[PDB]
Design a binder for this molecule. Structure first.
Ligand SMILES: NC(=O)c1cc([N+](=O)[O-])c(NCCCN2CCOCC2)cc1NCc1cccnc1
Length: 294
């Protein structure tokens, strides 16, 4: 690195290798993402550069976009743990409801902010939600999907997780809306509560059918226009909807109500981040300190 001192490899992200690094001049510790083929689209750099201005307490700050030696590096503020690791670590006892509520509330504030600035995430998952010792949680990688492209494989043949994909994406809709992020966050909310992924599909069709088996196969009544979707097939099995009381026990009715609104099939009926923040579930929200072992 021209000015960076690699501390350690954080992993192989969706867009490339990520390292925890220290700025030799500022002393600042950051996450450095090396972006993967041969050229680096100027449209991408302009788009990414715009995200440097998207600053909010619940959004991982994009510090710099470095385009040198015809290579692209993304410098992000560093956080010590991600929600996937935290959930695994909390698997035995479960994350306390007050902390689940604090995290959901903060994530919705982050989404409300991004969506108000016309920025979508499109690939929210526990691994992209970062936490610190102060009880904060932040969304990482907002806007990169649009600035770049389809995931599929990180850069070293790595199975793309479909568990948090909204149904309209799975049915081949070409235009994503802010609703896709609310769907993903609803899936994450459920997983924090039950300690098990809500829809752990291992293929696009298994993902879609797992959603259908739980929420019922969508029809024109609950989702106008669904039968005209690109990948909709009249041959899809018709499953009956299950009761939320069975899906996310023992979450209370306020929680079930909010989750149900975050998981509506019709993206237009799905609750917005702004509206969700006003839901009765957050009446008693607080900001607890998590037990973080680093
Ligand atoms: N900005 C960051 O600080 C950060 C960036 C990425 N990233 O991919 O760009 C990341 N992702 C790697 C996620 C690795 N996880 C570990 C356990 O859950 C499954 C995969 C984790 C991060 N911070 C938390 C973080 C996590 C681990 C070490 N250091 C910082």
């Amino acid at each position: 690195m021209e000015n960076f001192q690699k501390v350690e490899k954080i992993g192989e992200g969706t867009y490339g290798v990520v390292y925890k690094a220290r700025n030799k001049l500022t002393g600042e510790v950051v996450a450095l993402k090396k972006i993967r083929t041969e050229g680096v689209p100027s449209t991408a750099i302009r788009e990414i550069s715009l995200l440097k201005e998207l600053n909010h307490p619940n959004i991982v700050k994009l510090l710099d976009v470095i385009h040198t030696e015809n290579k692209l590096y993304l410098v992000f503020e560093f956080l010590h743990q991600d929600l996937k690791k935290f959930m695994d670590a909390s698997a035995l006892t479960g994350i306390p409801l007050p902390l689940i509520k604090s995290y959901l509330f903060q994530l919705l504030q982050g989404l409300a902010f991004c969506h108000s600035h016309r920025v979508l995430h499109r690939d929210l998952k526990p691994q992209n939600l970062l936490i610190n010792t102060e009880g904060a949680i932040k969304l990482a990688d907002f806007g990169l999907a649009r600035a770049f492209g389809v995931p599929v494989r990180t850069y070293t043949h790595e199975v793309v997780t479909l568990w948090y994909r909204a149904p309209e994406i799975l049915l081949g809709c070409k235009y994503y809306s802010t609703a896709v992020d609310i769907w993903s966050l609803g899936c994450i909310f459920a997983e924090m509560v039950t300690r098990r992924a809500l829809f752990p599909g291992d293929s696009e069709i298994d993902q879609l059918f797992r959603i259908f088996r739980t929420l019922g196969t969508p029809d024109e009544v609950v989702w106008p226009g669904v039968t005209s979707m690109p990948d909709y097939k009249p041959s899809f099995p018709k499953w009956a909807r299950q009761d939320f009381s069975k899906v996310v026990p023992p979450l209370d009715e306020d929680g079930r109500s909010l989750l149900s609104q975050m998981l509506h099939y019709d993206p237009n009926k799905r609750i917005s981040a702004k509206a969700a923040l006003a839901h009765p579930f957050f009446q008693d929200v607080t900001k607890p300190v998590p037990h973080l072992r680093l």
